[PDB]
Each structure stands twice: as C-alpha cells, then as structure tokens.
Ligand binder design. Structure first.
Ligand code: HEM
Length: 460
C-alpha cells in the first residue's frame, strides 16, 4: 500500500574503511564489475567513495520511479564530471539548470529534425559505400577487425553529416589520431576515479599526457572550423547551427568557447556509441547463425536498388529488431545518473534526501527476469515484435526525459543502413571462435572482435 511498507536497510558491498567502496573499482571493467555486485545484492545498493554517495538501480520497478522527471533530474556521474575537463559545458556534460545546456539544446535540436535527417542519408551512404568497398577489396584469408572498422564508419559519418568534414578514416590503416587521443583522454577520465591520491606525482605523467591528448582533439576542432570559415556552403548542419544559430529564449548565439566544446561532444557522442552497437550487433549475428540468415534474407528482399533509399532503411523491420536486441544485452552507453529533487522515498522502502544521487545500471535493467523472462542472456530480436509488450522504462539505452539522446534516430538510421548493407553484400564467419571481451572506455565495445567476410558478389 501507499507507504504501509517499512524502512529497509540498503545493501552495500565490502567497504574499506575511509575509502569506502572505492577499491572495488580496481578493474579496467567497472560496469561489468558493478553488474556482478547487483547480481549479488539485487535491485538496489549503496556505493560510497570519498566525496561520493550514489545508488545503483537494476530493476524496472525502481527505475520506473527514478525516471519520473517530476521527482528526479539528470545528474552528472563522477565519470561525466571528469570528462567535463575536456568536453566543457557541451550538451552531454552540462547540468540541466546550467545556462549553456538550455541555450545549446535550443539552438542545436533542429539538426535532428525529420527534414535534417532525410538529408544526412546520402552522406551516410557515401561512407557506408566506402566500408563495403573496403571489404570487397580484401584478399582471401585477410580479415576484418570489426570495431576498428565500425569506428572508421561512425566517425567519418558524424564528421560528414555534422560538419561537412572528411576524416578519411578508410585511407588510414591505423586509427585516426583523434580516435587515439580520444580513447586515451576517456580512459584517463575513468582512471581519475579509481584514484585515492589524485595529486601523487606518479600521476604527473598522466596529467601531462592528458593535456597532450586534449590539445590533439582541439587541434582537430581548429581544423574543422577553419575549413568551414574558408568556403561557401551547401551545408545546413550541426556546425551551421553552432556558429550561426540563436537561442529563441534570449536571442544569443553560443560563445566561441562553448562552440568548441559542442564540436568535441558531437564528434565523440556522434560515433563512439554507434560504433559499439554495430560491433555488438555483428557479434551476436555471427554467434547466432539462424538469426543472421533471417536478417540477411530481409536485407536481400528489401534492399533491391544498388544503394539504399531512406524509405528502404525504414522497411528493415528485422535489422532494427536486431539492433535493439544488441542494445538490450550491451547498451553501449551503459549508465546514466539522477538526483532527487526533494526528500522522498523510493519504491516504498528506501528514503532519500534532497540531492541524493542514483545511477541507472542499464545492462542490469535490461536483464530483469520479471520483465523479459528466464532466458535473459539469450540474444533474440523477436522480443521486439510488439512495442507494447515492453513496459515503459524497461528498455532505456537512450537515457531518459529532457536529457534523453537527441541522436537516437540518427544512430539507428545509420546502424540500420550499414548493417543492412553488410548483410546484403557479405556472408560472415567467426573464424577465431572469438571469446567476447568487453572493453570499457566509458562506453562499451567488444575488443578484438574479428571476422571473415565473403562477398556475395552483388555490384554497387
Ligand atoms: C547507439 C548509439 C547511441 C547511444 C546508445 C546513445 C546513448 C545516450 C544516452 C544514454 C544518453 C544520456 C546521457 C545521460 O543521461 O547522462 C545520451 C545523450 C546524448 N547523446 Fe546519445 N546515444 C547514441 C547516439 C548518439 C548520436 C548519433 C549522437 C549525435 C549525432 C548523440 C548525441 C548525444 C548528445 C548530444 C547527448 C546529450 C543530450 C543532452 O543531454 O542534452 N548520441 N546518449
């Protein structure tokens, strides 16, 4: 009943005196570690660290409440507070109440309109064609390093649709320097929070390396802008709105400083997670041959022209289901954080004070046997045939509310287009019997996943 229930004590994993649980994050796979703890302690547990108290939730029951924007706003997890050192008050790393969140949210959203989207398509195809031709052009016994390639595609794509700028990742056999520095900057951000003594001079090489990478990323931004300054455009894209658009509420455009932060934020946000998704989707597909056949058969049946049209991607009802079923198991942005607007009580049993933080552990949420069934670890896209059979807030890979992913249609449309084309033009083989090894650079990816494609010989 309403509150008939009585105060339950909040489970908590081993503490270590005055560092609390911080030692449990001694691992290069903290999300995976936290999933193990939630397996032990169930739907909710406290997790402290010097200058940090948060609460991890893993049940649809509790996340439903947490996602109630009348009761909880978006919080910056410690992870995001650190990433903020180089992503500034760009969209992902600003607070809802901060002036530049609202300003930029208003100025930029048009870039994700239906009309905008229809125009990104031809460019997505441009890049998608490159990926395919790269794979068409491999010799026999040569293999595909899947995440390195998905990253080439997704970064080239955001670069082109967002900024009219070509990274030409497919013309490099190593990763683009941006990617390299991004990864290091991100991996440092994650490390700064397993650290009890941030100022210990053993970390002074890290610090210097961090500024080195940040300069690398900014020099790319410099290039991106100069290239825009030096031309007449066709483009009406993200960058156009960043440089020229004015807030409807104030009449002001973004300042140069914040513009530089949005560019970094979109370069990262706009590829990183989508690459993870495409890498995971491909994984589950080769690991579940019968599912691949069904998807490949939809591709063949739907993608009848040499290159796909916007309308055709939308007809790929089953590939879409595959993508969603990949996000369910390994949501490439694996957490987001909320705080209580007022003193309250969550789920009838656990009181919170104003300001108290929560963290939605998305991989655990997506594994709630109440919601999905027993076979929770089984990859099965068919769970998505009926959108109404999935409760609200049971499936949340794009976050929640005002601060939900504005890039979601962009991302699925890209992934759907590319996966479709892959399935249409290749037969795949898990020649190594790859063992899944998930790397966490603050987002997730299947590290070292490799496959062999065999061309179906369909011309482009
Ligand atoms: C599979 C692909 C993607 C996934 C899984 C994903 C996931 C998410 C999640 C969970 C959040 C919420 C963050 C939070 O509440 O702390 C978010 C925010 C955001 N995403 Fe995505 N996203 C994807 C694709 C994209 C793309 C393609 C773009 C841009 C082209 C993008 C741009 C952003 C931005 C700007 C935010 C912050 C928006 C705001 O808070 O105002 N994302 N994303």
């Amino acid at each position: 009943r309403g509150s008939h229930m009585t105060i339950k004590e909040m489970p908590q994993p081993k503490t270590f005196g005055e560092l609390k649980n911080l030692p449990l994050l001694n691992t290069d796979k903290p999300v995976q570690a936290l999933m193990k703890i939630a397996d032990e302690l169930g739907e909710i547990f406290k997790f402290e660290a010097p200058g940090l108290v948060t609460r991890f939730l893993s049940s649809q029951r509790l996340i439903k409440e947490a996602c109630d924007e009348s009761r909880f706003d978006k919080n910056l997890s410690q992870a995001l507070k650190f990433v903020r050192d180089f992503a500034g008050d760009g969209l992902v790393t600003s607070w809802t109440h901060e002036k530049n969140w609202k300003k930029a949210h208003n100025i930029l959203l048009p870039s994700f309109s239906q009309q905008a989207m229809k125009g990104y398509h031809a460019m997505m195809v441009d890049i998608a064609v490159q990926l395919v031709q790269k794979w068409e052009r491999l010799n026999a016994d040569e293999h595909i390093e899947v995440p390195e390639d998905m990253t080439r595609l997704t970064l080239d794509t955001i670069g082109l649709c967002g900024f009219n700028y070509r990274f030409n990742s497919f013309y490099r056999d190593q990763p683009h320097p941006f990617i390299t520095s991004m990864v290091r900057a991100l991996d440092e951000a994650m490390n700064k929070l397993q650290r009890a003594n941030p100022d210990d001079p053993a970390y002074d090489e890290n610090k210097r390396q961090f500024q080195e990478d940040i300069k690398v990323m900014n020099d790319l931004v410099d290039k991106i802008i100069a290239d825009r300054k030096a031309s007449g455009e066709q483009s009406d894209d993200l960058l156009t709105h960043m440089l020229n658009g004015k807030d409807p509420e104030t009449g002001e455009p973004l300042d140069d400083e914040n513009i530089r932060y949005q560019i970094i934020t979109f370069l990262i946000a706009g590829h990183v997670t989508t690459s993870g998704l495409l890498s995971f989707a491909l994984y589950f597909l080769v690991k579940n041959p019968h599912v691949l056949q069904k998807a490949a058969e939809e591709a063949a049946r739907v993608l009848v022209d040499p290159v796909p049209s916007y309308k055709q991607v939308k007809q790929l009802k089953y590939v879409d289901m595959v993508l969603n079923e990949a996000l369910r198991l390994w949501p490439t942005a694996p957490a987001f954080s909320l705080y209580a607007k007022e003193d309250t009580v969550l789920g009838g049993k656990y009181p919170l004070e104003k300001g108290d933080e929560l963290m939605v552990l998305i991989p655990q949420l997506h594994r709630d046997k109440t919601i999905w069934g027993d076979d929770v670890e089984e990859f099965r896209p068919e769970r998505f045939e009926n959108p109404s059979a999935i409760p609200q807030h049971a499936f949340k890979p794009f976050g929640n509310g005002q601060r939900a992913c504005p890039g979601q249609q962009f991302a699925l449309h890209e992934a759907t287009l590319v996966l479709g084309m892959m399935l249409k033009h290749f037969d795949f083989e898990d020649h190594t019997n790859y063992e899944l090894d998930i790397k966490e650079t603050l987002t997730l990816k299947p590290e070292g996943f490799v496959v062999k494609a065999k061309s179906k010989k369909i011309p482009l």
